[model samples]
Target chain A: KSTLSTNVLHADDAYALENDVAPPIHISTTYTYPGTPDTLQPFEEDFPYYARISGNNVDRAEASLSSVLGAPSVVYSSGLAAIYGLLSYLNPKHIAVHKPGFGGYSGTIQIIARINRLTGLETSFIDGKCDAIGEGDVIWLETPLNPLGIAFDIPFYKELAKKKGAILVVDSTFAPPPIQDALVLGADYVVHSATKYLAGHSDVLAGVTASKDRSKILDLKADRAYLGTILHPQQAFLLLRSLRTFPLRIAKHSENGFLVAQHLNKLATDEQFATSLGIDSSLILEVYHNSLQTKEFVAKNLTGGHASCFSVLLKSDTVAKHLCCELKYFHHATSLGSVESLIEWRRMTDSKIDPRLVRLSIGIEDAADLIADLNRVFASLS
Target chain B: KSTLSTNVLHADDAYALENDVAPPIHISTTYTYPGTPDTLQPFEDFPYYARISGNNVDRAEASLSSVLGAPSVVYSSGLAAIYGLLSYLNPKHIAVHKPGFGGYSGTIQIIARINRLTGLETSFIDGKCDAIGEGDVIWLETPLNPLGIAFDIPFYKELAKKKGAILVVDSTFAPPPIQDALVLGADYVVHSATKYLAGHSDVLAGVTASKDRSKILDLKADRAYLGTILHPQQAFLLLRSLRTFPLRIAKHSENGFLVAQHLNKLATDEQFATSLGIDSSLILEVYHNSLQTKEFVAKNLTGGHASCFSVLLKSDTVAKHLCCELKYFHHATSLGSVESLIEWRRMTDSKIDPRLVRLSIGIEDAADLIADLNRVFASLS
Candidate 1:
């Protein structure tokens, strides 16, 4: 009978009430029992009876997430831990994941390899278009796929999962629950790298999964518990507080992205423009923005504008790498969804990305100022 | 070169510097690459190019713990995750653990059973206190083995591990680093719940291994990272703070034990005493402070005394349960390293424990006052 908002917030309250304050870092390796059967049972379940079974902080965070996600959510030390836990639980003979996605998927591929070596699990990769799925397979769908910001049809994939009798896990890092509801679309499971838009500030990294079904949820929870991928309680608490501001921040990021995309499109009109303005000629080659796609599928699938991310294909890997280092406003770092803008040369950095591609992450800064900063940086590229 | 204390405190300055505080949680799922090759390569290692691979917070914790434990450490979402990670990493054909340890071991055993069904691996138990061990085996020694007291011959076990070429992991919950050098005594890896004696009163779990010649520590860390069973930054900070008080609080516990042991020895002879007048017939059995044989060993082997704990083998489980339930001076629950007193009939509720045995914890109260309170509670029973 509880609403979604009520559930997420409820987990934090459980932590606050038991510990007499918001859960602090319980660094001890053991807990004290209250002398009798009556007190011990509740205490054992409330506080972690042992550090290895559950950490007090992680439980509080899980409680908060379980409420918000409308599923029994478990915390992992990192997003990969969650992925490993989910993969471990699926024990899938075969797994179908999106190709050309986040580099972590490459790490996951390594996990699949290790799992195969240790437990004989098998894995496969498919195009992001959701075209190569098979029956009874685990499908991992990443909407607004990494680097390129290309989105897949959530409803179609969800229906596809049901028809195929496969478990559909949607990676909603680019399109969070607030932007798109994967669970409502009939997906069996919804996962997020909370390190991105959810945590917004780039200070923490975490992974979360939500499911309505108790058994599946319990499986994921157990996998995470066994894998030690649960988030720390204080980190959970921080993520909970950060979620409140997610909608506002994401809106601003989208607006900035649209303006930047429009400006780049206009700048490419004149063939002589690059030479006259002393800009790198590679900027005129090609631009890949989900918002710029002529396909009607984009209109049908995308509810709002394309997210804050957009990619530009330069004439060469050298130009893309040059553009990345030339920019002053964009920081050269790993991790996005922060207030600061970032630009990445995907081919040079992430080996899986196209050689001439440069990934841009628009932040919550003013569009005009960001455009001006980009113009100044590009003008010096010659 | 940094001192051990300095290394423990400041191993990861990046965590502290980035947050500008002790450390704020790094909650983001992915990092943005600033199109520069120079900026991206440093962060790109392992599967963590995604936030899911690693968190800044988790990295901070891992770095800090690696320095503190003098070995690589990983973080898990929960303590069970760490255990699960270890079980998978060792992939030991068999495991030998004490029967009556914590319940999570049972949960792990069940999971291992399932793994066996899937042809992944198998685990078993070597009966408690038997010298049966072999190479390629995982040995768990819960010293003070949750019965609340026992002699922990660290040297003999370390020798046993060396002779048999076995991986020996010591759960040193009863004796922390300030009291016992688990690494020096030959434990390939040292594990602690960090929920009890570390004493920050927060909820976090952790395991620390050593960089010693034994491959056990390295294997544990690798498994931990793969299984995601690492500590959190906040939890690590709290644990670091706990090392400061180990010498002080545990010493107070030993003093409290001396006082309680003095009183229980006289309860029978002081039949005509005013304090015992009402409880003359009620006092059928009492295992007080002096009955702890481990105290002398603790003093000689380590620096401090055992926390004031003694087992009361009542005539019946019900009577002991009633006494624990009715006690005014002592409350029911788990024991050893807390400021308040708790008594539990270990055998009555838990099937693994001895029947009619009651474990009592001592607090820092006046000896006369604590004894008076116990007399009053005994009068009621």
Candidate 2:
């Protein structure tokens, strides 16, 4: 545990049940119960009761994140499944959310609150002060929330949750560990779609939740048993290995976004440059980013950088669509937070976003190289 | 049974399951037949074997067991229940019944081996008044086999409740109309399901029922490793049997009651006995649902009697003669089958009081059944 990289990679040094050094991918759906009082329940004393219940790979993935996140994380089959479990556990009469979030959460949730109603309920968006939430509720907060890259004041959400007797869950998926210390701000829990930056290769699908109250994991475990949204063992192992480089990947991802935003933000102001490039300077419209996040908010919440990706609002959807088509480096993809860069016209994919807005999940690449790719695409748009 | 249709009508079989396409009896032992694009991607670092539960195993248990246990697993035999029970019961398995077990190899050796292996202390208690402890499972079979004397489950229910022991009932003799073990406060219920559940007498299987999931998880884990799980073919057959359980059981009871009434009438009717050249003393007693099914019948025993019942004859002489003369009622050892079968008294006990004839009344015509018994009795006289 000398550094975050060391802890993340070696955090879970798994091996075969008996002797093998390498953890033998343990896709063993079930295990043999030794004779005599052949104990049926692995849930009681043994590790990994069953694949559907828990497994070696799932534990490894959870173990990998615990050191970095400062809480024991439990992996679920999918990102939505983990969120669904928490919502079901809370089952609040009211959930709090911020508008223009990426996910489907009623209260200050990411995906701007219902990227497909990730949770079963339609989270009700609300105006927040500490008083809006009652006891036994939840406040979901995300910063530099995706698509718009506008973040929340993490320090404020943490205090608001405590004063209101609610749990504040920070979606740190947009930005990864070290960069967003949501837990250190006294937030009750941190969640992520490990399907994204965590499994940067995009070869697996998974989600995880690192919680302050470790006992609540038992409740989620029970929900998982009945719900049966179990992550395959292979996916669990892949995600575990991917997290070793989460710190490294997110750092580069943030740097690339910041660099691209510097260029885009310059065009936001430099009308002369836009005109010389043969584009209407007004057509640039706006650039949404963590650079726009408050200096104080960044200083309080982030230890490294804020942005995982940035959004560009073009003058029209036609221009945004044209810009995405013209990009050389970025691929038009449905998902984001992968090793490779992806840009999607948010309006075509999700109706909730502004039709003219296009979002990019910056990849780990040379700063000048990606800028060149975007520069050529922008010229075509003009 | 055919994988329960995804679309099931209420009257068809309240116990229905979800795969619409006929789920095949995956007897192939492994699911590797459906290979993945990259064998490297889908292959479990471990290979899938028959010992582990698979698609059909899941389908069968989900379909066959939802009747009582929300989660259930199938096994190879009645004793298979002990392997599963001891895993969850942990500290011990309780012994409540007083009887002789069947096995030509040696009963003492089998029981001793189980005790030595399971490390469970065996006790001999006359009633539920015995001191029961935590981690103890009270195993009892209702309506003692071959002697359809139904016992009150509520009395034992309270015994286990007050004494803190788990009640594990062997409901093989009585599946439904007779009792639903889970509905009462029994912690776990067991069945030599091959007899009644498989129905056709072709399959040899066992199943356990319980309200708690902890027991199933442990047992499912144990069986996966022990390799005592049922084959997919047997599960397929059991599922097929379950679809018609209610209808078959109803007919079994109907035929049982009708035959029991005719036997009762022949016991008293001197003129009819004389015309048939049969002695009035030829028949002594008939053990069945309509006769004496204890007070629980009002609470349990919905509208049917369990399929098999014992009939007491005057002596072994009449039993031997009648056993040979019967046109139907195949002389077979197993009970609770779709085909009517009878076994002689000596096969069960060594020091028998009189000749005992047990029958698993098939879903056959009542008149035809009565005629077979009448012919046998007439031939004996």
Candidate 3:
């Protein structure tokens, strides 16, 4: 427990002792005890009498995470499970969300819409501008918001949330802690799409919420157990393994992102019709990067490193689609935070999206090679 | 999929492919399409949008178990979870059970009684010898039932069940499918302490049921999901592993039980003194073993083979305490299948248990070693 590495090693050693090796998949549904009336009493306590309430493997994994996250943590079957846990507690008659947030957030908005239809709950979507929030509402803010990669001023939002008696939820998927701790910034809840940065390898899908409120956490835990969305023990172990190298991975992602952004910025500024595959310059237009923003709010609020994502405002929807279709190294798919690059024409894929936007997620591969491949594809579009 | 081994290897390979060599865990709460109109579909169909309806990992494991059990199997968090699911579908106004079942069954009986109190349903406990069942009543018959092993005749009970229009439940912990497929006999439903048989190494708690009635299975599945007692992914994995050698382990248990019964028979025949730890010496005392009762139901039913189960007898209260204290193999608890075990005195612990009975389980140790240990432990008592 001296350092994080020591903490991890110690935990591994502890599991090894109890399990004979390093926990060879404890799949038991129930345990037995000596048949004394006295012996059975303890079994009736917080300890599990059945796997539905808690399993040994799950309890062990949660114990490890709780130690690291510095709060009680419950694992869910999926990220949606975590969200469902939170939603069960929400009696929000009015909800306010950032207008142009991540595509996944739109699903949550849809759920809210369902809630409205079923239970007559009211909801509103606001442009993420500072002045849009109102009193007595639930406000959702996504930092380094998806596609746009824009960072909202946490302190300003926090003050607004308090004044309005609104519950503030910050989707910190793109903003891992040490860069921005939304809780420290006074948000009521900090949500993460752990499927992204935390999993890092894009191998699993998960959502996590960390809050200081014990009652809220307990309520979420009850919902998770009752909804049967509890995370499997193996997934918990995988996430724990990924967390050890999170800081290192994030640093590499930032470096690669910077390199790719610099290249894209240069390409946007240049007017010389340099063509590798005989394409013209008419298809290309402007590139959006975290570094390109001139507003003082962006400078003061954003940490030096941004997510490995950037956006391109293509000259036309057809040009954006052509570029996405023509890319070689960047696979055309959804999901990011992998070792391979992925590119998508947002408008062609998303009906609610701006027709001329192309989204790029920088991977852990060689930045120069990625730029070369993109340059080749962009030239082909000409 | 050509052979069982090939199927297993292929399944493993598919898992590896999906999970990136380590088996990818799909923790996605909601799946998304690239466009507008986010359509959430029920799990019974293709798109499993909710965990309560279905989970990818859980579905994969359930499919695997159903393939092995050769019945459309449904999994639950514990044995009680299975019972609760079954009870939810019971249309009968009353149910009957053997009095000295497992302690948890008492809670279930209480719940049923509470339901009756609320003007919904009721249940009655009938002794094994009593003709206490009637019209529209569900019957619970645990062969070699918990706290004490007491075998019931399958053919006779099945006839009674048919006559009474009762759903016949057999908790075949004493005689698992390894002994004999109880389903082949008279049981309308079979239940196991999956914690014992399914989780061999003592890791999980679950119950699995296989029935021909699709409607009943669906009803149980719905209740299971709502109760939130569905098995976890790890538990499913463990249960799957246990099923691999279930027959082999049950065979081992039968051997152990045979040796234990032999020792008991010898002690009774010799009329061993009370001081020598042979507590009872009744030669005509009823012993509920498949081998002993083979002649009576040979034509109609398969013989029982579940190893190391409970027993019921007309004995003094001291016998129950003596059974608990007498043990050379560490007085350990748990049965159906394990490495070592002892007879637990359930009546002493449970408020509703019948008098003078104990439940015993068998472990996968040498029969001679267990017999010698039991003899030495009994001598002390």
Q: What is the DockQ of each candidate?
A: 0.01, 0.01, 0.01
| lDDT value, residue A12 of candidate 1 | 56
Docking class of 3: incorrect
Compared with the true structure, the alpha-carbon lDDT of candidate 3 equals 0.53
Q: Give the per-residue lDDT digits (tens) of candidate 2, residues A1-382.
A: 1456445644565422543222346798887755455655433312365788777777777778787787877778877777776776776655676554453322234432443354444455535574557787778776657567766778787777788787888777776677777778777878877788777755567877877777786667667766787687877765764664466567677887788887887876798886676656666788888776555676566667867577888888888888887765566765677655678887775666778888887766555767777767676666
Sorted by lDDT, highest first, which candidate order results? 2, 1, 3
The structural similarity of chain B in model 1 to the true chain B, as TM-score, is 0.65
Q: What lDDT does the true structure give each of the candidates?
A: 0.53, 0.66, 0.53
Off by over 4 Å in 2: A14-22, A36-47, A100-126, A273-280, B1-381
TM-score, A chain, model 1: 0.82
The parts of candidate 1 lying over 4 Å away from their true place are A1-11, A18-23, A37-47, A63-71, A100-104, A127-135, A269-282, A297-305, A350-353, B1-381
Per-model TM-score, in order, reads: 0.47, 0.47, 0.47
Which candidate has the top score in lDDT?
Answer: 2
TM-score: model 3 vs. ground truth: 0.47
How well is each residue in B1-381 modelled by candidate 1, as lDDT tens digits? 333322332345433435332344444445565557655665313433422244543444454354335443434433443454345444334355434543234335544664665443334444332333444444454434333333344544554565463454544434443244344443444444443434323334454455552443454445534544433454444433332233324434454456445445444555543444444333344443235465434532354444434443324453454445432234534333322334444533465433333333322334433554456545554
Per-residue accuracy of model 3 over A345-372 as CA lDDT, tens digit each: 8765568777888878776555666777
